[PDB]
Amino acid sequence: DDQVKKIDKYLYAMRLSDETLIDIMTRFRKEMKNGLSRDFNPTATVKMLPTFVRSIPDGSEKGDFIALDLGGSSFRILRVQVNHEKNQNVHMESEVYDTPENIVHGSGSQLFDHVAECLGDFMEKRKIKDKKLPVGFTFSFPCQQSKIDEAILITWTKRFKASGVEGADVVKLLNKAIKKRGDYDANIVAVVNDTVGTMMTCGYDDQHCEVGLIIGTGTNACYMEELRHIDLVEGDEGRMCINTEWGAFGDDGSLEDIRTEFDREIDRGSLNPGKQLFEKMVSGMYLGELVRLILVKMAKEGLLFEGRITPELLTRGKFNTSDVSAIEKNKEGLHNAKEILTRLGVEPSDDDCVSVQHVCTIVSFRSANLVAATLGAILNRLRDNKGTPRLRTTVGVNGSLYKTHPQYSRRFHKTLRRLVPDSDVRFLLSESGSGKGAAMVTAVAYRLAEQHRQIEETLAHFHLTKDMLLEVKKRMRAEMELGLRKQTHNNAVVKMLPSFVRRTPDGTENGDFLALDLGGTNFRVLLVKIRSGKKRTVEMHNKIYAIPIEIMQGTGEELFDHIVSCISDFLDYMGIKGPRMPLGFTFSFPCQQTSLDAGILITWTKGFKATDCVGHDVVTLLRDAIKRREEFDLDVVAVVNDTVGTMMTCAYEEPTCEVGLIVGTGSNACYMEEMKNVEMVEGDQGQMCINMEWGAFGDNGCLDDIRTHYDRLVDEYSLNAGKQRYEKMISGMYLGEIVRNILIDFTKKGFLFRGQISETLKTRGIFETKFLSQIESDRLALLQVRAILQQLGLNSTCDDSILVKTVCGVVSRRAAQLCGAGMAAVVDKIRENRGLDRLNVTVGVDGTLYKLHPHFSRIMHQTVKELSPKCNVSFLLSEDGSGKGAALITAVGVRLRTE
Amino acid sequence: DDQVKKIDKYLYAMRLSDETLIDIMTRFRKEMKNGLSRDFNPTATVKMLPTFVRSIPDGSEKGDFIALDLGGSSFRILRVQVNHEKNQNVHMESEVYDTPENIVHGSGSQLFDHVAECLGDFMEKRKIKDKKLPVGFTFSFPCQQSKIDEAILITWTKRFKASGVEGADVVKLLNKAIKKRGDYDANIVAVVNDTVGTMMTCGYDDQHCEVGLIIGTGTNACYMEELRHIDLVEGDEGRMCINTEWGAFGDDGSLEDIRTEFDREIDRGSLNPGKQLFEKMVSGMYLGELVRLILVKMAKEGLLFEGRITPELLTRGKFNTSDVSAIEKNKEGLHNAKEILTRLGVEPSDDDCVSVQHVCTIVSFRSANLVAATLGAILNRLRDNKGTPRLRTTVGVNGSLYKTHPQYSRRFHKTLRRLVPDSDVRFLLSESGSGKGAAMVTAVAYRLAEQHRQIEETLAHFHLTKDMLLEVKKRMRAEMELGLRKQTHNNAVVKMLPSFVRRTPDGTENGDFLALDLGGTNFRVLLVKIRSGKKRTVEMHNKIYAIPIEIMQGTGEELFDHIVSCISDFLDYMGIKGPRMPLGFTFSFPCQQTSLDAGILITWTKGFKATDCVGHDVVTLLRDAIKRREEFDLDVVAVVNDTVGTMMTCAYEEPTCEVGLIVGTGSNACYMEEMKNVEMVEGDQGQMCINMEWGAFGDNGCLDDIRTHYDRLVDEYSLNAGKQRYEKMISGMYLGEIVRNILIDFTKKGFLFRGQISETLKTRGIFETKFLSQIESDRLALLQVRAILQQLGLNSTCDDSILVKTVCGVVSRRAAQLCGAGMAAVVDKIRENRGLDRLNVTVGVDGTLYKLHPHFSRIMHQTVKELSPKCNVSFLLSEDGSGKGAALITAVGVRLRTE
């Protein structure tokens, strides 16, 4: 019996006590938490990689799929089919392809060309190249994943070392490999670890399976973790499968007290020195060589074959894990030991066979015990996660060692069940490998990819290319010409209305003025005091006055009676009732003007429809309401569009400013034009500011080209169907409605909100400028987004929130680009007007969407820079409102009136 | 009692039950939590802004300071002198500067010009213009700060509305206005809120002060929060003052059930509509106007003065909060109300006076109550942070309303104490204002600014401009010349040794080869099989062999006996013991060669110093060690440098790979030179690979220009003092040592580790390549950085971690650039040699530092691209060591021999 008690003492370090295993396990429980923490992950050796599989197959899976399986004993390509509706039970065929060492060690090219070729063949035989079969990929190395169809190889393991793969995406790599062939089309939809594939395969038959275990060439386990623990994945919704990659357990020295001189020597001879140190004590790629190392040591010390030592005993790999298994068998154990050893050249005695067989025991008993240590850890995590006093789950298993060895399973289970007695675990041996599980994943992944494809399809219609934007710019410029020219003005949609403001502030404006600001979100009355000279100053006051639902769509008399009523109040407020003051009237709707102080409303826009206004001179309507009340007198000197008011406001301090842009409730622009071009106003000397009224761009159909189903819905249900189409794709009053309509469509499609169209979602105006601005804010956690949506009344999940955010960004991005194309046309015409090669001009901007939105202005400026590269445009934000500029314009009105 | 009975019923919504107050208090509580969370902050109206003030004064403050105070009811500039070590407690002189409307409502430019001008007038009269007086800036508006001397205005409040300031750093704006004057210098070293200033002022006198409260023109409060609760500031150590900016409480509609029609109306006339809504119910700027609006409402409804109404009563601002105070005085309240109302034009009756007074009462009482609720939330907050049943704290206070109102303080205090039971609260009214506190902050800020200045000054020596880098390139080019021309070779530092490798693999290399890899981090023996012809493959194996310290610096005989010992073991491992295989020797040290198979060790580099090796032919030393065993024999065909080996390994695949580079333990490079320029070897036909041994660049002093005190220390303490200068600023064996020496210096100066130079810090090697690469890993968390350092033995804080990361980054960056300039020289020489205008060549790269570092390669590549623009350089990383290329050289060796 010394033959055994002696070995026992020698390989003493490789016989771990329950005491020790307990510590190993405790240490893995820590390594798991560290690997899950957003803070500790970057340092952790156990990556706890997220796999993006949300749960085991439920049975709803159906279709036809192709599965790949690389990285294991052999490169396997399967085919799985299922359709319970048509009562078609799971069916599958599979084949194996040869993979010579040279390819496994060559460049990724040689390799992924090889896989693509074996796939080309596999489909050529069954004649399925023409069928749009979804491919699933079982790739069994640690991988960086942000989506199920992305796999960035973190590092080769086992027997693979292929150049130019680590850090790359094997999906794109495989794809490219195929492409080169042109032999077939292949839709790689998913990539899973064999651990994950194995958990899925068993989960399919056992609804309790929460773990995926592999003990073959390599070792590694996956399990079902709570999202509220995967710090590295935005979400708390249910669970997800974590690929622990425990092979690398201890690559940081955490297990140096467990590793022996033998582990260190096998390491120094390994393909991946320093890495996968836990695995190197476990999987079947190493066990055989470990034994051979121990046997070489003993032999060198005479403990075996006297001390005869052959060159074959010193040769790397002469001693397989096959031999380890064969030697461990109960009947032919020693018979085989003798044979295997005789082939080695040594002179195997019957005693030698018995010693060698015991070594094999020690080495294999250890591996099995280690896996029991770590797997025990996982189960401890599960029992904890839940909170139940006991644990009852199923563990899927696979791999050559576990399947072929005649003592491993038995031993492993026993040690495991012992370590965690509070568990009723059931081991289930995968019989299809990963195929079934893989395909069960490819099925869900494809399902999800189809929705996505459709989402992208619809959203793609909102994408505009450099060229399409150049066209829009070109169409804008053509429309501008049409509006300026007397022969075409009547049919032009872009009216190019003269404002009768001939120059920007000349610094002689002086006096006290009243002003109205009507048409934007806030109607207000203002008092503006301007003092010129050495020390020039501006002093303003204002008061917002609400305009009731009724009054805003009521009779004209009511509207202006209200306005004047508000003027009265403000005069009291300022303590200036009495004197007859001059008044600048900022009225933000298209007006036909014959002079600065006359403006005839052409049409209501935005939210206003007051009866008996269109066709009248708004300055007259105002004077009437003034005489009607009869309290006080005013001298209405001017009527100004907010674009022009804005340009003048900014021109005050910025003499380079000659353009006015509004992007708020509505959208519109103005700029300084040459009188010779304004064919609608007699005289070709000097300049005049032109209120473009560009919102009506597209009203003659010139944009049907890029308007979508959702744009037409918004237009069709608006107060002014058919009009202001350009504006309706840009401004805050409308952007939300576009988004809303898209979301309704997506919900009916079943993409959103579990397919339930909320009563809220049917409320128009739900997505205000404010909401859209908040939703699109940067680095804004999904949790906050979802919070905002629930605030509106929208019951939504993380996925919903993501989709909504995407949608808002697509709509607002397009708004900024279209706005940019118009402005690009404008500044470019100015450049040509001055006959310049380069032009520096500044735009005065205002509007709630422009001020609040986190991307609009940025993307807008970008677009203008790219579309009019011969112009350097500066956008200046107006902080005072239009009042200043209106006052400044009223000052000139007075001098020319008092002229 | 009738009069008050009815008024109470009329303004019912402005009288707040403790039930309501406790309601509001709970709300603010939630709002605080939201403002502090990284998830909800972006949508929270209460901003909870970090202040970067760690604690109240600790008595160590001392110096001469200037303090600005803007945003309050008056613009003040002060001077604070604090000298404890000189009986000089705290002395201050202040001066008020008139600040007219126009300035406060005009352009940011005027505003800060005006400030800069006043600061000038101030310093002029005191003739202190010449002293280095640090400036602290009290700016009572909400600001985003990443550090104490930065202040980005978020939004104007109170009476301010100057254009071009929101979103800007008021500190820059001020310096800008100062530099535009030319009158003086100003060291603005800190910016604080007035609540912070107040807290620090009271804290000076009362060590229990944990809150600063303002109830004047505007209202706000700050308090000491635990750093662990402050998400927006990385760190969990200690506390920091938080500026709640509680004026914006309710701006999201949070307090609409509290807000009345009067609040809504005062809003519509405010300078900032829809903002600071909570503040608009509380502070002095609003309380009076709020009262007026009620008198007007009541008058219109008959409830006052028979219902009479005057233009005065209807005017904005005719009823100041000042009048509110007077009318609430015990003795003269009603008498004062008589005078006030009689001036307003109405015919005040004794009842009117009583009615009015009771109005003021309700208004000011609500104000006080509201503040009690929010302060209560804070107090309760402070307590929970301690986790104790009771709370004892002092609240610093200031503001015109709180100071001058005859009832407010009392009522405020009353309600507060009733709302927070288990707490003793002292209300210390700041008599000096916030100026003293501001100065206390300034003192610590300056003290800190001085540390940064010195640190930045030190680190700047590691900064290299594009120009400097061009020089390094130029100098490198010169050295290359000297090394090639035999006229100057002997004296040249960069040796440009000939490798006697004349051409990159031609594609015919065939056979089996042995290889040695000695000089890098791992010594290994390799077996390499190269099959040429129609099908070309390369199969290689290898084993790592540890070279024990002793042996590494023992005797040449022991070293090479060890080498040959391992060669013997590997032959066993591979099972090829017997045949006389050709061997390729990769020897990573400078060798004088007269032929491919002859190499004289010129000198040791890196960590090697075996004796009686230098001056010997390393092939001879090997062949000898082999003879000394006689176990076997071999055919050493070549001695190769790792640069040459790496270039060949990579040129095997890429035919434009004419350059080699190593950035590992050491740094060096090789390239294909033209025999004409290789004056040291007879002939001018064909080409030859030149091992530059560029590490010795600088050994002749040609870099003394950029080498630093720390470089000299690292060099002076090395095994090869004075040699390999260039390399010591680049490779993994040295960079860590540069860092360690900088850290030691910084620690003595007292910038790091509490000035404690630990035993760990004294240990050389501490900052290995591995560690150095983790620390700089992109987007790594501070705790992660702190964790790793703690793991080293360096007990360090978060600030400590910040500095260590910065240091590491400066060193690694310089290294990458220096390396880049070297390569730029090399590639550009080849370009010119071949008289090309543009050159496309690829470089084979190897080395742990190059592989593991998160920035080196990126920065290096970028530098090459920038210094040699007429070159397009590609970097191919060698994934399988120098072995391949070495065998490829062996091949052409045995061949050219027989051929």
Ligand SMILES: O=P(O)(O)OC[C@H]1O[C@@H](O)[C@H](O)[C@@H](O)[C@@H]1O
């Ligand atoms: O490497 P081994 O011993 O074949 O075991 C692991 C393999 O087991 C197979 O059955 C699975 O299909 C593969 O996905 C897995 O990689």
Ligand SMILES: O=P(O)(O)OC[C@H]1O[C@@H](O)[C@H](O)[C@@H](O)[C@@H]1O
């Ligand atoms: O429609 P919005 O978002 O209110 O923006 C446009 C308005 O912006 C205001 O700032 C201008 O003073 C108005 O003249 C203008 O109509």
Ligand SMILES: O=P(O)(O)OC[C@H]1O[C@@H](O)[C@H](O)[C@@H](O)[C@@H]1O
């Ligand atoms: O608004 P008020 O009445 O000036 O009160 C607040 C001010 O109080 C002063 O005492 C402080 O010095 C200022 O920093 C602060 O802004």
Ligand SMILES: O=P(O)(O)OC[C@H]1O[C@@H](O)[C@H](O)[C@@H](O)[C@@H]1O
């Ligand atoms: O010094 P390091 O970090 O090991 O890197 C350089 C070494 O890298 C190895 O990969 C090469 O095979 C050696 O030839 C080379 O000397």
Ligand SMILES: OC[C@H]1O[C@@H](O)[C@H](O)[C@@H](O)[C@@H]1O
């Ligand atoms: O094949 C089984 C295991 O081998 C390990 O070495 C790999 O790192 C894992 O990806 C895999 O689960």
Ligand SMILES: OC[C@H]1O[C@@H](O)[C@H](O)[C@@H](O)[C@@H]1O
């Ligand atoms: O308010 C911005 C713009 O809105 C457009 O719909 C109006 O027709 C314009 O007059 C106005 O400038």
Ligand SMILES: OC[C@H]1O[C@@H](O)[C@H](O)[C@@H](O)[C@@H]1O
């Ligand atoms: O000065 C009183 C307070 O007024 C508030 O409105 C400001 O935003 C604060 O910065 C300031 O502390």
Ligand SMILES: OC[C@H]1O[C@@H](O)[C@H](O)[C@@H](O)[C@@H]1O
């Ligand atoms: O190993 C990298 C490099 O280190 C240098 O210091 C040695 O002198 C070279 O021979 C070698 O190429």
Ligand code: NA
């Ligand atoms: Na998560």
Ligand code: NA
């Ligand atoms: Na004209």
Ligand code: NA
């Ligand atoms: Na923090």
Ligand code: NA
């Ligand atoms: Na020569």
